[PDB]
Design an enzyme around this catalytic site. Structure first.
Site, PDB file in Angstrom:
ATOM      1  N   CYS A  14     -79.230 -68.796  27.282  1.00 30.05           N
ATOM      2  CA  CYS A  14     -79.780 -68.838  25.936  1.00 30.05           C
ATOM      3  C   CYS A  14     -78.716 -68.592  24.914  1.00 30.05           C
ATOM      4  CB  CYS A  14     -81.006 -67.978  25.736  1.00 30.05           C
ATOM      5  SG  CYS A  14     -80.816 -66.197  26.116  1.00 30.05           S
ATOM      6  N   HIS A 254     -83.670 -62.363  24.112  1.00 26.20           N
ATOM      7  CA  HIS A 254     -83.595 -63.818  24.086  1.00 26.20           C
ATOM      8  C   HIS A 254     -82.886 -64.253  22.811  1.00 26.20           C
ATOM      9  CE1 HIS A 254     -84.525 -67.883  25.267  1.00 26.20           C
ATOM     10  NE2 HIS A 254     -85.106 -68.128  24.106  1.00 26.20           N
TER      11      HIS A 254
HETATM   12  C1  LIG Z   1     -81.522 -65.926  27.845  1.00 25.53           C
HETATM   13  N1  LIG Z   1     -82.022 -66.914  28.487  1.00 25.53           N
HETATM   14  N2  LIG Z   1     -81.463 -64.556  28.446  1.00 25.53           N
HETATM   15  C2  LIG Z   1     -81.900 -64.119  29.641  1.00 25.53           C
HETATM   16  C3  LIG Z   1     -82.594 -62.662  29.269  1.00 25.53           C
HETATM   17  C4  LIG Z   1     -81.894 -62.176  28.254  1.00 25.53           C
HETATM   18  C5  LIG Z   1     -81.020 -61.002  28.749  1.00 25.53           C
HETATM   19  N3  LIG Z   1     -79.759 -60.819  27.962  1.00 25.53           N
HETATM   20  C6  LIG Z   1     -79.804 -60.199  26.604  1.00 25.53           C
HETATM   21  O1  LIG Z   1     -80.830 -59.860  26.153  1.00 25.53           O
HETATM   22  C7  LIG Z   1     -78.528 -59.968  25.843  1.00 25.53           C
HETATM   23  N4  LIG Z   1     -77.301 -60.095  26.328  1.00 25.53           N
HETATM   24  N5  LIG Z   1     -76.419 -59.759  25.324  1.00 25.53           N
HETATM   25  C8  LIG Z   1     -77.131 -59.415  24.260  1.00 25.53           C
HETATM   26  C9  LIG Z   1     -76.564 -58.970  22.889  1.00 25.53           C
HETATM   27  C10 LIG Z   1     -75.251 -58.583  22.793  1.00 25.53           C
HETATM   28  C11 LIG Z   1     -74.733 -58.194  21.576  1.00 25.53           C
HETATM   29  C12 LIG Z   1     -75.547 -58.194  20.439  1.00 25.53           C
HETATM   30  C13 LIG Z   1     -76.853 -58.575  20.534  1.00 25.53           C
HETATM   31  C14 LIG Z   1     -77.751 -58.567  19.247  1.00 25.53           C
HETATM   32  N6  LIG Z   1     -78.398 -58.555  18.303  1.00 25.53           N
HETATM   33  C15 LIG Z   1     -77.375 -58.968  21.762  1.00 25.53           C
HETATM   34  O2  LIG Z   1     -78.416 -59.543  24.583  1.00 25.53           O
HETATM   35  C16 LIG Z   1     -80.898 -63.348  27.750  1.00 25.53           C
END
Ligand code: A1L7W
Ligand code: ZN
Length: 301
Positions: A14, A254
């Site tokens: 995503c 997401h």
């Molecule tokens: C997309 N298909 N997916 C699978 C489930 C989610 C899990 N990953 C996250 O939620 C994720 N990973 N990094 C971040 C992030 C990093 C830095 C700043 C933010 C903000 N606002 C979010 O979130 C993704």
């Protein structure tokens, strides 16, 4: 049906679909990619093993510049080429790898920066340093009831109010070392910035990722007010093209992107779109502005 193609998401891509949808909204990045891949088309066309070629044909199909009959595109080839060599860090990975391939003209996200550190207790100025940026990562100040958080407030804090305590003042230290009685004042430094060259594609990053005292990641969901038009004259005119929005928490979140419709040429459309991977729906400017932006892509008018 003036819509853009979607992107498949098997489960954890995503962060890339959201960035790709936003990068396809900046026409100058795509134009710079074409003129950069022109070097490979000098002999035959080089249909391969190159990151710029893989990125360009993805962005050209997402901006509706190449005819696409599949209502959904698959960007997995971009991920495999990256592995053989967070949507913000992916942006910095893509821009860096493109610069390594060019190591021609600089990509439209490339900017120049002049920085200086000043002590808050004696106004001693550090030596001036020269930097480059591909995006302006801004802190989000503290919220207050009845006091709304704006993007300008974040930009002023980034320019002349960013605090850094990885440094210590030489003047306050020589003075505190005297034969008398001197009290140690808290080392408070502010990093005064001044932007030199403004890039023609502007990426603004709002730091929503924080860390607790025990190392657990925390997310700031506070809304930051922004507009479709952003002037950078007080920090020396940009039009908002797309917005990457992150929902949920850091673990089961997401990534989604708001983006403008592709032009019918060179004239920016007023029709915004909501793209959640393969799902593409129409949206209004009111919906775009009411969202908590993570990445803001602008273009110099
Ligand atoms: C997309 N298909 N997916 C699978 C489930 C989610 C899990 N990953 C996250 O939620 C994720 N990973 N990094 C971040 C992030 C990093 C830095 C700043 C933010 C903000 N606002 C979010 O979130 C993704
Ligand atoms: Zn000092």
């Amino acid at each position: 049906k003036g819509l853009v193609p979607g992107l498949v998401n098997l489960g954890n891509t995503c962060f890339m679909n959201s960035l790709l949808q936003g990068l396809s909204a900046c026409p100058a990045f795509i134009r710079w990619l074409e003129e950069f891949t022109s070097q490979y088309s000098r002999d035959q066309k080089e249909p391969p093993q190159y990151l710029s070629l893989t990125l360009l044909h993805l962005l050209k199909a997402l901006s509706c510049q190449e005819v696409t009959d599949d209502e959904v595109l698959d960007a997995s080839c971009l991920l495999d080429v990256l592995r053989m060599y967070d949507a913000h860090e992916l942006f910095h990975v893509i821009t860096s790898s493109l610069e390594d391939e060019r190591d021609k003209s600089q990509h439209p996200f490339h900017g120049r920066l002049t920085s200086n550190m000043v002590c808050k207790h004696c106004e001693h100025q550090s030596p001036v340093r020269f930097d480059t940026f591909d995006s302006l990562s801004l802190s989000i100040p503290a919220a207050t009831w009845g006091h709304p958080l704006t993007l300008d407030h974040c930009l002023h804090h980034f320019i002349s109010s960013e605090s850094v305590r990885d440094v210590v003042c030489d003047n306050c230290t020589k003075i505190e070392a005297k034969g008398e009685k001197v009290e140690h004042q808290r080392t408070t430094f502010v990093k005064q910035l001044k932007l030199g060259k403004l890039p023609q594609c502007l990426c603004i990053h709002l730091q929503r990722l924080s860390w607790s005292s025990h190392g657990t990641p925390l997310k700031r969901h506070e809304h930051v007010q922004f507009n479709e038009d952003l002037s950078m004259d007080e920090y020396k005119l940009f039009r908002l093209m797309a917005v990457v929005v992150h929902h949920g928490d850091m673990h089961s979140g997401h990534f989604v992107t708001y983006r403008r419709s592709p032009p019918s040429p060179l004239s920016t459309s007023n029709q915004w779109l909501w793209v959640s991977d393969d799902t593409v729906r129409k949206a209004s400017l009111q919906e775009v502005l009411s969202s908590s932006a993570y990445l803001l892509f602008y273009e110099r008018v």
